[PDB]
Design a protein around this ligand. Structure first.
Ligand SMILES: [Zn+2]
Length: 179
């Protein structure tokens, strides 16, 4: 299984977050609706090298399920391959990748610096299956792992957040925070 370990790296890489999508810092958890815009901010302390790329991948949070590949349920599976949970919208250079050994899916875009008038780079992710989809995530928590990689694919930085894809993000966040 791919590592989830936070690695700020040489460029001081971290994530930020701004109901269709809501983030709980206390839980390090995003709650979002299926197919809706999920803004994830990339923050760096120094400019990454030319051709730096940003990869997103989902894994199960629980150790006992970590070897299982996160993919869309049969119903939802039937630019993006239909099996992929995570898509990117609003980007002309999206790559959908299937690992030849692990079969794990990921979605990659080029790293771009913040637009003029901004301090961070935003990527709009879409999650295409609900956490509750049986025959898929089966209510089991997932993590999204965001990796900053150089042009050769080498690790520059890593961060992660838990995700629940659900009908009522605000309500579920409140419940999970009360728990
Ligand atoms: Zn589904």
């Amino acid at each position: 299984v791919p590592s989830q370990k936070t690695y700020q790296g040489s460029y001081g890489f971290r994530l930020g977050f701004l109901v269709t999508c809501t983030y709980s810092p206390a839980l390090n958890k995003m709650f979002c609706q299926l197919a809706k815009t999920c803004p994830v901010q990339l923050w760096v302390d120094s400019t990454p090298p030319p051709g730096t790329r940003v990869r997103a991948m989902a894994i199960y949070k629980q150790s006992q399920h970590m070897t299982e590949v996160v993919r869309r349920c049969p119903h939802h599976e039937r630019l993006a391959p239909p099996q992929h949970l995570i898509r990117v919208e609003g980007n002309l250079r999206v790559e959908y990748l299937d690992d030849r050994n692990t079969f794990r899916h990921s979605v990659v875009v080029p790293y771009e610096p913040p637009e003029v008038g901004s301090d961070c780079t935003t990527i709009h992710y879409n999650y295409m299956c609900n956490s509750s989809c049986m025959g898929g995530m089966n209510r089991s928590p997932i993590l999204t792992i965001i990796t900053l990689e150089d042009s050769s694919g080498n690790l520059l930085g890593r961060n992660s957040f838990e995700v629940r894809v659900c009908a009522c993000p605000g309500r579920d966040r409140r419940t999970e925070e009360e728990n």
